[PDB]
Amino acid sequence: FLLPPSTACCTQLYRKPLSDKLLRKVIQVELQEADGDCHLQAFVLHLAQRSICIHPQNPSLSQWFEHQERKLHGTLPKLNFGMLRKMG
């Protein structure tokens, strides 16, 4: 059981605040669309070895917007996540 890249249809959620240590290995943030990909919405984090499913309303994802902006060596995708930006 693993969530395949860009195949995010998580019916389950981890719901834990992820460790920043492992976060520095989360090269991607993949949005589970509530229709465009799966039948529900989720913010799941794509590590370089795995993907974890997070509840859209989760501080770990919001903090990750801050953290990813200062981590990942400076490599990020085109995420216009301005609807959250810590305010989620």
Which experimental approach was used here? Answer: NMR
Exposure letters 43-80 (e unless 16+ CB within 10 A, then b) = bbbbeeeebbbbbbebebbbebbebbeebbeeeeeeee
Give me the residue label for tokens 């998580």: 10
Amino acid residing at 87: M
Amino acid residing at 62: S
Name residues whose C-beta falls within 8 Å of residue 75's C-beta, 6 or more positions apart in sequence.
27
Asked if 8 contacts 53 with a C-beta cutoff of 8 angstroms, the reply is yes
User: CB-hemisphere CA count at 13 Å for 63?
Assistant: 11
For 68, the token pair is 């990813």
Name residues whose C-beta falls within 8 Å of residue 55's C-beta, 6 or more positions apart in sequence.
13, 15, 42, 43, 61
